[PDB]
Structures are given as structure tokens and as C-alpha cells.
Amino acid sequence: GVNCTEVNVFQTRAGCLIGAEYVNNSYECDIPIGAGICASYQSIIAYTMSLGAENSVAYSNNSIAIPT
Amino acid sequence: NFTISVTTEILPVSMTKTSVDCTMYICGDSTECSNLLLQYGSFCTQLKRALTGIAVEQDKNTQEVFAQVKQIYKTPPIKYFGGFNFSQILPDPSKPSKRSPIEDLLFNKVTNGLTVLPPLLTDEMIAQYTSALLAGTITSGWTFGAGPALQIPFPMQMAYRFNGIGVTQNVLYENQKLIANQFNSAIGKIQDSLSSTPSALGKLQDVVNHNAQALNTLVKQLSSKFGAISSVLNDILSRLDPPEAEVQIDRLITGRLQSLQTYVTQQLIRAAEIRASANLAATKMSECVLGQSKRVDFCGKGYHLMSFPQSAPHGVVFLHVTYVPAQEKNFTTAPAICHDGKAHFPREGVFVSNGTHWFVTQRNFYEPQIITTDNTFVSGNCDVVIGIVNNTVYDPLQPELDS
Amino acid sequence: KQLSSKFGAISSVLNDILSRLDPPEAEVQIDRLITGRLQSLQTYVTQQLIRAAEIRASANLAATKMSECVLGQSKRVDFCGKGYHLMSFPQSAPHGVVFLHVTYVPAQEKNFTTAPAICHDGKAHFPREGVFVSNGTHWFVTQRNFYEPQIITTDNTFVSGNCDVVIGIVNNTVYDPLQPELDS
Ligand SMILES: *[C@@H]1O[C@H](CO)[C@@H](O)[C@H](O)[C@H]1NC(C)=O
Ligand SMILES: *[C@@H]1O[C@H](CO)[C@@H](O)[C@H](O)[C@H]1NC(C)=O
Ligand SMILES: *[C@@H]1O[C@H](CO)[C@@H](O)[C@H](O)[C@H]1NC(C)=O
Ligand SMILES: *[C@@H]1O[C@H](CO)[C@@H](O)[C@H](O)[C@H]1NC(C)=O
Ligand SMILES: *[C@@H]1O[C@H](CO)[C@@H](O)[C@H](O)[C@H]1NC(C)=O
Ligand SMILES: *[C@@H]1O[C@H](CO)[C@@H](O)[C@H](O)[C@H]1NC(C)=O
């Protein structure tokens, strides 16, 4: 919770983060930080947490699935 | 005749994470404070470890309350689920927060040295989780939390839900329009009732007033004399003689440490209460949502069918769907039917007679059928059953063996 | 560790204060030491009882899971294991217990085309326990968790109502064994 305008540096919605770059790609969360920010050692990068694979399932008015 | 109604119950999940600056809240900018606080053994590492463990506990509660699935399901683009209005429940992309109107309505209705940590999961991924859970419970039935998801149409899923409470599925397909209209009317009534009633939202507001009051009373106790000469560091450490000022500041920081340890005690008690409530909320999440729970009261007043959770600030809200029958009708019954010296017993229901004719019906609905041998089983003879009556039974395929 | 704390006194040893200073003050030093140690043990007791609170909460949960799933089959979904409940087994652990859940995961699915009812001779047919499943040409009834198709028979279907009230119905024949049984 510190706006670091007086003391790479990337700004999260939790304060200041020093020493971890920001990557637009998303991966599974390993170390929780806050405000949807999770960092892991790939150097050390900070990424938005991944909620999982977008496993969209089709739907119709006459489609059923039965396991075999 | 049956009436489908929706009931709402709310369950708190977690609270805002708290971190206190220990030596700053005790007394700041003083070397005498440091050399009198370092010689007390440890009154501060325990509170810091306990507070961090409580914060980790709240994060874990946010984890297993809402994240029961490892997939993010997306709703189909078709908005026609069989005449059923899923508009106040299913979120729409037109809103900037990607939230349902019910969630937006409840969110709008819901209104030193201390630091409040932000939660790991804010409102947006909780809303995405609720969207994924509603997609899984709508377009995949209940067979998605146990193995892979399967394509399940909505009406035969509803027929399965009626079949889970001992009611045959044929009653749905003759009254599908009435059920859809009743469910939509109940959704509209409960959407109006969530905003009309001001005291449908209490504990969450109460417990956040508890948290705010506990946060404010610490600073309120920060400005008390504690029986010393003064309550200000620069007035007690400059004017006074340090032979007595050391004892005065010792008593002051002793009172301050007693106050903060009392606050830590209330915080851990409230965190234990929140953890128990979140565990019961996780049980409700696993039972009333991911499948059908047959036990009464556990998921709604009456017979449970399904439920639709919605995202809430620092909590979760449930939207149960209950099967409440009505329109009672008096009848005359019998434990068994006597025919040709042997007794007949019902297989799925009970023998129900209005006048001089006897019919077999299911338990939770009136569907008069002719008494045949395909839904009855024989046992013993007609000499021991108390209250048996004499009535003929229809023999199936009769005009068939002689034709 | 709290024994080696000065607590604002000269030393943390009772024999040192009593054999080096006069009683009057020594009284104040021992009073400060004893109230500091009293607050320390009260804090320890509070910590012990809150861990007791969480531990009998966990013990009640473990006893409930032992009596339900272990002693009998639980129909509660996602209560003992990830999937349908088959069996579980208890294992002895120091200061705890470990369950061994056996689940039922019906993977490797394949989708088909269904119908809520089948129309024949002006009356609708409904399955007692299965669901009508078509693979494109013919029709079959199978279980809700395993694909074991069977021919539609009057012995595992029940009739109710007519063909106009129900929507989504299809037209197909039904096998009645009395028609090949009567002529034989
Ligand atoms: C901090 O202050 C700067 C300058 O006003 C601003 O640009 C930045 O967005 C602020 N960040 C935070 C944490 O509010
Ligand atoms: C289902 O019904 C809706 C509304 O009539 C229609 O838009 C959609 O295309 C239909 N889908 C199928 C598979 O029949
Ligand atoms: C129940 O009563 C309502 C009118 O109040 C009617 O519209 C509905 O069809 C009835 N349903 C049954 C099951 O009798
Ligand atoms: C529900 O009814 C409202 C009426 O405005 C409509 O806008 C919405 O699209 C409907 N949703 C469904 C899924 O029926
Ligand atoms: C009882 O109901 C049956 C069928 O609804 C009917 O045939 C019979 O006449 C009724 N009995 C009387 C006394 O009305
Ligand atoms: C459907 O199943 C039946 C019985 O197994 C088979 O005779 C028929 O060829 C199948 N149709 C297709 C299109 O696979």
C-alpha cells in the first residue's frame, strides 16, 4: 500500500513492486500477492492469475452426452 | 397443485486482511521505546505470526468457498433455455463489471499504524467464478463436478430433478409452461424483494460494523493516559525526569500492549467464527449447488431442487428453488387390496379412493391410474392385513389372450 | 524463551535480585517479573485454547466423515473424494487420521441425440429409469451414467397422457413381446 513516487518497477493495486517485471501473458498462480497478482520464478515475473482453461461446452435443444 | 418459490439466505465468507505496525502502534520515533521494547522477550512476534496466519486463513477461505472447479465454463449464445428467463441470474457483457443485475443491486445496497491488506481475489474473478458455476449448473446439469462436463438439455434435467424427490417426470411435460411462468414470476418477485426489504441484509453489514468498530476502538484506546502522567510521547519523555519517566512510559506501553492483545483476542475469535461460517458455506456450495441434496431444510424450506449462487462483497448469497405443494384434497385409503384370497401392495405409491372406486397414485401428486398387476406385488394371504378392503384388480392384456 | 526476559527489571534471575538488592525494591522487581510472566502464561493459555477450538472443530468434521462415508455409503456429492462415492478406508496416523477415498469418474464421453418421449398409437411413452438415446438412425434407451443401449420395450416404459400436450416428442415404434408371443 505505498505509492512509490518518492522511493524494473511495476505498479500493482497493492503498493509498489520492485525487482519483478510485468508480463501480459497469464499463468497459474504460485505465490499470492493480492488484487489478482501472482508472481513465480519462470528471472522473476509478475502476471495476472489464470482462472483456468476456457472449456466452453456446446448447447442445443436436443443434444445429450452419455459416458461409455 | 404445486407452487415453485425461491428463498434467499446469505452466508458470510471472509473479511478484509489486517496488518498492524507493532512498534509503530506501541510508540514511535524513540530510542528509549526501542530499548524498553526489545527487553520484553517477545510480545510482538506472536501477534504478527497470528495475524499473518489469520490473513492466510481468510485467503484460504476465499479459495475453497468459491473455487471448486478447475474450468471456466462459458454460456452458450442462445438465450432460449425452454421459455425460462435466465436474465437476472446469468451475467451480461453490457455491464462494465460483468455482473448480474441481482449482484449489482446487492453491491449497491451494501455500503495510526494500522494497514488493511487488499484481498487476493477481488470482485471480478469472483463474478467470473459465479458465471462459470452457473454455466456448469445450467448447460451441463449436475454431472460436471464429478468428472468431465456433459451436454445436458435444461427440461429433461428439470425432469431428473423432479425424479430425485420421488415424483414421476411426466408431470413436468404436461405443465412446462406453468412451471416456467411460476419460476419467472418468482424471480421477478425475489428481485423486487431484495431491494424492497431493507432488513434482508444484516449480518454482513453488522459484521463489517463489528470490524470497523474494532478498528476504531484501537485508535480510541491509543489516546488514553493509562494512569500515567500524560499520553503523548514527546510530552512524557522530555518534561519528566527519566528516573520516573521510564516507569511512566513502561506503564503506558504495558496498557497499550494489553489493549492490542485484547484486540487480537477479539480478532481471532471473530476469525474462528468466520472460518466456521465459511466451512458451512463450502458445505452448502458442494451439496445444494453441485447436485441435489435430498435432506429437508438443508437446501431450502421444502423439497430441494437446485440453487443459483451470486457474488457478494465479503460473502456469498444463495438463491434456492423449492418444491412446495398445495391444494390439499381429502381421500379415503387402505393399506392393501384383497382379491381372490391374496393381498396386493402398492409398488410406488398408495391406494387412493374418492368414492366407491379405487386408484393408485404417486406420493406427492394426484395421478389416478387403474389398479393393475404391473405396479402391484403380492405377498401372503388375505387373513392378516388390518384394514384391508375387497376390490377387484384389472388383469393386463386380458382381451388379448382370447382374441 | 520468556524466562530470559528482563521485564523492565535489573535481571531475569530470582536468585540474582534477592541476593544483590534490598527487599523493598526487590519487591517491585519481583512484582514486575511475576506480572510479566503471568501475562505471558495467560497469552499461552489463550493460544492453547484457540488451537483447541480449531482442533475439536476439525475433530468433529473428521468424526462426521468417519461415520458417514466410512461406516456407510454417502450419497452427498463432493463430500468424500472428487467424484461419485464408492468406498473409502481409514489409515492410522500420529495425531490425526488419513482417509483413502475411492471415486468413480465417468470419462471418455460421446454425445448423441435424445427425445423426452416417444409417440406410438396416439399415446406418449416415458422411460421409468433411463433416457431415450438415438445414434442417428434407430432409437435406444440406456442408463444415465453408462452407455449400454437397449431396445424400447413396454416392460421398461410407462405411458401417460397423449401426443399433443408433450412437446418435443418423436414418432417411433415400440417393441411389445406379446405380438411375437401370441402367434407362436
Ligand atoms: C501515485 O502518484 C502518481 C502521481 O500522482 C500517480 O501517477 C500514480 O498513479 C499513483 N499511484 C497510486 C498507487 O495511486
Ligand atoms: C432451440 O430453440 C431456440 C429458440 O427457438 C432456437 O433459437 C435454437 O436455434 C434452437 N436450437 C435447436 C438445437 O433446435
Ligand atoms: C394450479 O393452479 C393454477 C391456478 O392458480 C393453475 O394455473 C395451474 O395449472 C394449476 N396446476 C396444477 C398442477 O393443478
Ligand atoms: C428475461 O426477460 C427480460 C425482459 O426484459 C429479457 O430482457 C431477457 O432477455 C430475458 N432473458 C431470458 C433468458 O429469458
Ligand atoms: C371418483 O373418481 C373417479 C375417477 O375420477 C370417478 O370415476 C368416480 O365417479 C368418482 N367417484 C365419485 C363418487 O364421484
Ligand atoms: C446405430 O446403432 C444401431 C445399433 O447398434 C446400428 O445398427 C446402426 O447402424 C447405428 N447407426 C449409426 C449411424 O451408427
Side-chain angles (χ1 to χ4, degrees):
Chain A
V2 170
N3 194 359
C4 61
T5 69
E6 71 266 21
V7 73
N8 203 11
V9 167
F10 166 66
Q11 167 69 34
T12 68
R13 281 275 166 175
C16 198
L17 179 52
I18 297 182
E21 58 168 296
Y22 189 51
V23 171
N24 288 113
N25 214 56
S26 79
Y27 298 99
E28 195 83 53
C29 175
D30 293 347
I31 299 169
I33 297 309
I37 299 292
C38 282
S40 168
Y41 182 79
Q42 73 170 353
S43 83
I44 286 182
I45 56 178
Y47 48 85
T48 315
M49 61 156 298
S50 287
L51 314 158
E54 192 177 321
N55 189 16
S56 172
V57 55
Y59 178 69
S60 284
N61 324 353
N62 215 8
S63 68
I64 191 167
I66 296 291
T68 73
Chain B
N1 203 329
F2 58 95
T3 296
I4 288 183
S5 68
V6 285
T7 77
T8 52
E9 82 271 16
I10 305 170
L11 282 83
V13 169
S14 79
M15 271 315 198
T16 78
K17 293 187 286 185
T18 318
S19 298
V20 65
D21 287 318
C22 171
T23 185
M24 187 66 204
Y25 172 67
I26 288 285
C27 55
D29 293 331
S30 178
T31 61
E32 292 91 2
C33 274
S34 69
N35 56 55
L36 289 176
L37 197 71
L38 63 87
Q39 72 177 1
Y40 286 167
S42 56
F43 291 166
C44 180
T45 61
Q46 303 89 9
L47 66 88
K48 194 74 158 175
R49 189 182 68 184
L51 212 58
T52 48
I54 287 308
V56 168
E57 189 51 272
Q58 304 283 352
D59 289 334
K60 193 174 92 75
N61 274 346
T62 56
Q63 196 71 270
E64 291 83 3
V65 172
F66 264 100
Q68 282 85 15
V69 287
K70 61 183 181 293
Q71 322 282 124
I72 303 302
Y73 295 93
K74 197 176 177 181
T75 186
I78 173 168
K79 312 300 289 193
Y80 182 76
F81 282 122
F84 290 76
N85 193 260
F86 285 102
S87 188
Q88 319 303 289
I89 297 100
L90 189 65
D92 47 351
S94 306
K95 296 287 306 290
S97 294
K98 311 298 162 284
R99 297 197 269 191
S100 291
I102 293 187
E103 315 167 6
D104 193 15
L105 177 65
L106 61 93
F107 184 75
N108 272 354
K109 176 174 265 198
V110 166
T111 60
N112 217 3
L114 71 83
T115 312
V116 170
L117 296 192
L120 167 71
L121 308 185
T122 181
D123 52 353
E124 61 98 17
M125 61 295 277
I126 298 171
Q128 194 74 33
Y129 286 163
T130 56
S131 166
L133 293 174
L134 271 295
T137 60
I138 287 170
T139 191
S140 180
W142 78 92
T143 174
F144 73 104
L150 312 176
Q151 299 98 24
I152 295 298
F154 182 76
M156 42 76 68
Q157 176 195 357
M158 295 299 102
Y160 277 150
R161 298 312 186 103
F162 291 168
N163 211 355
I165 51 166
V167 183
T168 47
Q169 62 197 239
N170 56 348
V171 72
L172 186 142
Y173 293 109
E174 308 166 353
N175 294 294
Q176 190 179 6
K177 160 163 288 172
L178 175 72
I179 290 166
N181 266 9
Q182 280 191 43
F183 175 31
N184 298 340
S185 283
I187 286 299
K189 283 198 283 310
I190 203 65
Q191 181 213 348
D192 289 331
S193 163
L194 183 63
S195 190
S196 70
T197 313
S199 89
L201 274 295
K203 54 172 178 300
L204 274 297
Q205 296 69 14
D206 303 349
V207 69
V208 73
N209 190 269
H210 269 299
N211 195 11
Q213 200 265 344
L215 206 61
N216 283 122
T217 190
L218 201 66
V219 178
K220 195 64 65 66
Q221 274 300 129
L222 181 54
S223 69
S224 65
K225 297 175 75 173
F226 279 113
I229 296 305
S230 87
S231 77
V232 177
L233 264 293
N234 296 115
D235 201 7
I236 203 166
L237 267 190
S238 66
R239 182 248 302 273
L240 278 75
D241 195 17
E244 75 255 11
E246 284 285 270
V247 188
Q248 290 318 296
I249 198 60
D250 171 86
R251 189 202 293 99
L252 185 62
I253 67 169
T254 304
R256 269 160 179 204
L257 69 90
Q258 289 176 0
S259 171
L260 54 79
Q261 76 182 356
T262 300
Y263 171 71
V264 165
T265 306
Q266 270 85 64
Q267 272 279 336
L268 57 84
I269 292 157
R270 211 158 324 273
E273 295 181 354
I274 284 302
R275 162 87 180 155
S277 175
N279 263 356
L280 190 152
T283 307
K284 291 277 289 294
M285 182 36 49
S286 161
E287 295 201 6
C288 309
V289 188
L290 312 186
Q292 186 183 305
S293 176
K294 63 95 177 178
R295 43 200 198 149
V296 65
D297 311 323
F298 186 72
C299 311
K301 202 74 192 151
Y303 309 114
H304 172 236
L305 288 169
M306 73 292 291
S307 59
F308 318 112
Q310 312 289 152
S311 163
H314 305 124
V316 68
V317 58
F318 277 114
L319 184 63
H320 284 335
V321 168
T322 57
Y323 180 87
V324 177
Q327 301 206 12
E328 306 95 294
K329 200 164 169 67
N330 275 324
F331 289 110
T332 306
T333 177
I337 299 298
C338 192
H339 170 83
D340 295 339
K342 65 208 208 313
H344 283 206
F345 285 88
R347 165 163 292 165
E348 72 270 14
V350 60
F351 289 113
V352 168
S353 54
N354 47 313
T356 45
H357 306 139
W358 296 80
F359 305 98
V360 64
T361 49
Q362 53 187 351
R363 186 176 65 245
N364 302 309
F365 203 82
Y366 193 36
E367 278 204 322
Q369 316 201 19
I370 319 165
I371 307 176
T372 47
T373 76
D374 47 24
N375 45 356
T376 58
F377 63 98
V378 303
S379 77
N381 270 329
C382 191
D383 77 315
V384 69
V385 181
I386 295 185
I388 196 165
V389 295
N390 310 330
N391 186 27
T392 180
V393 59
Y394 192 82
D395 211 20
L397 55 80
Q398 182 59 17
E400 282 277 350
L401 75 164
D402 49 353
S403 296
Chain C
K1 297 296 181 183
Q2 290 285 80
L3 286 191
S4 315
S5 171
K6 299 313 140 165
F7 285 110
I10 311 292
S11 181
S12 83
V13 176
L14 305 187
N15 192 217
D16 199 3
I17 311 294
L18 280 185
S19 66
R20 221 158 60 176
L21 292 173
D22 46 1
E25 290 63 24
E27 277 323 286
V28 189
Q29 299 327 294
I30 297 310
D31 208 0
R32 276 194 285 176
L33 190 141
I34 197 174
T35 190
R37 289 188 183 180
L38 200 64
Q39 294 332 287
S40 180
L41 54 87
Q42 284 280 348
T43 299
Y44 165 71
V45 162
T46 303
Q47 192 265 336
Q48 262 292 326
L49 60 83
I50 194 65
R51 305 297 279 163
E54 62 80 14
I55 206 162
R56 83 292 183 276
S58 164
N60 263 4
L61 173 65
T64 301
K65 255 164 192 189
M66 186 66 204
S67 159
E68 281 156 344
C69 303
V70 184
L71 311 190
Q73 166 178 354
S74 165
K75 286 154 301 284
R76 316 158 81 173
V77 191
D78 210 302
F79 179 61
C80 293
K82 214 83 180 73
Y84 291 155
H85 193 104
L86 305 192
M87 285 307 303
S88 66
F89 314 113
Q91 298 300 314
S92 169
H95 298 160
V97 74
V98 165
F99 289 96
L100 185 64
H101 299 329
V102 178
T103 56
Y104 177 85
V105 185
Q108 202 186 340
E109 65 261 25
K110 159 162 196 217
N111 63 345
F112 304 111
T113 296
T114 181
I118 293 190
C119 194
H120 193 259
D121 308 323
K123 47 162 68 80
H125 277 72
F126 286 82
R128 313 161 195 297
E129 92 286 337
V131 62
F132 285 131
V133 169
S134 79
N135 62 322
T137 61
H138 311 85
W139 290 83
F140 290 106
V141 56
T142 187
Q143 304 171 182
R144 313 169 181 180
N145 282 320
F146 198 86
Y147 182 52
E148 198 174 11
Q150 292 195 358
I151 186 59
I152 297 99
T153 302
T154 190
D155 282 276
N156 57 348
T157 61
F158 65 99
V159 295
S160 74
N162 66 93
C163 204
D164 210 0
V165 191
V166 60
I167 211 66
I169 206 165
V170 295
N171 296 6
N172 200 32
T173 78
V174 58
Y175 192 23
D176 172 73
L178 277 296
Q179 317 303 315
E181 193 64 37
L182 168 69
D183 47 352
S184 174

